[PDB]
């Protein structure tokens, strides 16, 4: 009988605290980079304003697809620890070198004298690519920062977690990772604010932005070394579940064969449907609700007063959703928690689009509440936007990562990479393409409200169906693997 502190075994505690610290450090770096990259690529000595859109449209998704293909073969030819280090150490060393060498020597490595010769060579329509060349370093930083948030946060960390955590411990401790994730976001936001202020408070004659960037990248590399040390500690001094002996399988090593299996797998299909539908739903409904919001509050002061209260409610809901998620995971299981998000989004979206499309009929009904139907739509969309963003680290991400645990390591790792790197940017891109198609069809997103609502209905319906099928397959895998382990161990 090993000792138990706080009602939890010391071994599980010893495996969970370093995981929580790793996730804290990872999201600390993620927030620092997510702010540094956009405050950096625009405040560059020579930088077009169409340099970030080009990196969001034509660079982000191809880079994600290329990283998926690279990671598949790397996992095929490397062990778990070797792959983790091979993926994360380049990020850490690049951010350190950028903070200490590449940014101070930015006038030296940037080909300003070449991407004006080639700008007289290639017409102004090619202003896009030329711009990146002109500040390639910073642009690479941007890309790498994006990749960090797409890879180190999702593939690296959560792959490690699903590799070392069982389904029971995942139900017990994944919401408590989101609590701590939010603390990392809070503290990293305060750190970014502190260094933004420090850039100005320090006296003249000093490149305050250079000092702030050096300090922020020093924190980035410190947290990265902390992540590496915690990974080494968990892999050395924590007894990890080995697997069920079904672990043996022919290594595919076919980047065509592996992808063909992933597209033909009914499990990855449903999981990718969840991810894609989540991204599309929040993006579309967020745009529509913000348009209605602007219509509601014409004055600046009222708009900002409402977006103080919205943030306060967002924080309160984040806290209460963390607690409620740790409760529902303990009590009802994976299926209920996986279906809570699409059902609530569906109900709130139906109410929202009903108050939008039919405001006339609903005017007497909402008048009982003392609200203009526009204001009712604003509040419904605000509550939906709150539930959808507060259930990420509490309700959606825990379910998504725990769906990976009962899989075999081949499919686990490969589907993790192919979903959390490629399918999520595809969700965002599909939402954008959907809205653009509605615009080109009907001239405006205001003239496409019924069709936007109908396609959102279809998307969340497919989300619910995928959640149901995924929960069925998830229970099937869990039962099969537990019975197989108990039969081979008997």
């Amino acid at each position, epitope marked *: 009988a090993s000792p138990k502190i706080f009602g939890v075994e010391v071994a599980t505690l010893k495996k969970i605290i370093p995981l929580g610290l790793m996730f804290f450090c990872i999201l600390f770096n993620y927030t620092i980079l997510r*702010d540094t990259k956009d405050v950096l690529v625009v405040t560059a000595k020579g930088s077009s*304003a169409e340099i970030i859109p080009f990196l969001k449209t034509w660079v982000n998704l191809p880079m994600a697809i290329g990283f998926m293909l690279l990671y598949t073969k790397l996992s095929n030819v490397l062990s778990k620890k070797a792959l983790f280090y091979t993926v994360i150490v380049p990020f850490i060393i690049y951010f350190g070198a950028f903070g200490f060498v590449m940014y101070p020597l930015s006038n030296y490595i940037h080909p300003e004298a070449l991407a004006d010769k080639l700008l007289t060579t290639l017409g102004p329509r090619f202003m896009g690519p030329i711009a990146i060349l002109r500040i390639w370093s910073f642009c690479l930083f941007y890309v790498m920062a994006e990749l960090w948030g797409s890879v180190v946060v999702s593939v690296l960390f959560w792959g490690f977690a699903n590799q070392i955590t069982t389904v029971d411990e995942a139900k017990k401790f994944y919401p408590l990772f989101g609590l701590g994730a939010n603390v990392a976001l809070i503290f990293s936001g305060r750190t970014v604010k502190y260094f933004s202020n420090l850039r100005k408070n320090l006296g003249p004659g000093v490149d305050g932005w250079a000092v702030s960037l050096k300090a922020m990248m020093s924190i980035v590399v410190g947290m990265g070394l902390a992540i590496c040390l915690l990974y080494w500690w968990v892999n050395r001094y924590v007894p990890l579940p080995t697997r069920s002996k079904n672990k043996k399988e022919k290594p595919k090593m076919g980047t065509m064969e592996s992808l063909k299996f992933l597209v033909s797998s009914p499990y990855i299909r449903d999981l990718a449907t969840l991810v894609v539908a989540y991204g599309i739903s929040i993006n579309l409904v967020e745009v529509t609700w913000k348009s209605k919001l602007k219509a509601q509050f014409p004055s600046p002061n009222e708009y900002s007063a409402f977006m103080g209260d919205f943030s306060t409610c967002t924080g309160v809901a984040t806290f209460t959703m963390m607690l409620l998620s740790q409760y529902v995971f303990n009590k009802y299981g994976w299926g209920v928690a996986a279906k809570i998000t699409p059902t609530v989004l569906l109900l709130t979206g139906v109410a929202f689009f009903s108050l939008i499309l039919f405001g006339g009929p609903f005017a007497p009904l909402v008048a009982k509440l003392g609200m203009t139907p526009l204001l009712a739509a604003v509040y419904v969309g605000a509550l939906q936007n709150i539930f959808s963003k507060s259930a990420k680290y509490s309700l959606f991400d825990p379910c998504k990562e725990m769906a990976y645990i009962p899989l075999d390591e081949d499919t686990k790792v490969k589907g993790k990479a192919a979903i959390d790197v490629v399918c999520n940017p595809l969700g965002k891109s599909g939402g954008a393409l959907i809205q653009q198609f509605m615009i080109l069809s009907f001239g405006s997103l205001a003239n496409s409200t019924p069709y936007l609502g109908m396609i959102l209905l279809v998307i969340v319906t497919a989300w619910l169906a995928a959640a149901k099928s995924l929960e069925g397959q998830f229970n099937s895998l869990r039962s099969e693997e537990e019975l197989e382990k108990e039969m081979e161990r008997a």
Partner: nanobody
Framework: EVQLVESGGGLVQAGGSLRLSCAAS????????MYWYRQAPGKEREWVAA???????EYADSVKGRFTISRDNSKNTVYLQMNSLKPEDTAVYYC??????????????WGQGTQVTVSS
């Protein structure tokens, strides 16, 4: 810091055209939603037209069908074309940016405004 400068406001006859231009600096102007407000003397500041990071161009009903907001990423500036102007469009027009992130301290940045007067 964040800098927003408006231009193009002037004196035009009723039924005329006028193109406001907000030049922005110190933040990604293509990644945040840019607003256009107007304020008349004796009245509160009211919203005119916004454009999102995607360029989706939501307008106020008072100017819908006549005004056209358009962000040019090549020149890094937001634009507000005003066709079929009418004498109650006379006001000081401001371009606004909100919620710029943790690197910024105010949550609201405005230009100094540009005067648009429409003569009857």
């Amino acid at each position: 810091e964040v800098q927003l400068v408006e231009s193009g406001g002037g004196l035009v006859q009723a039924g005329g055209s006028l193109r406001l231009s907000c030049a922005a600096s110190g933040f990604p102007v293509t990644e945040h939603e840019m607003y256009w407000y107007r304020q008349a003397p004796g009245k509160e500041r009211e919203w005119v037209a916004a454009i999102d990071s995607y360029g989706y161009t939501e307008y106020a009903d008072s100017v819908k069908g006549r005004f056209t907001i358009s962000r040019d990423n090549s020149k890094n500036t937001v634009y507000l074309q005003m066709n079929s102007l009418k004498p109650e469009d006379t006001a000081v027009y401001y371009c606004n940016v909100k919620d710029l992130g943790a690197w910024y301290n105010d949550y609201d940045y405005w230009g100094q405004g540009t005067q648009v007067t429409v003569s009857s």
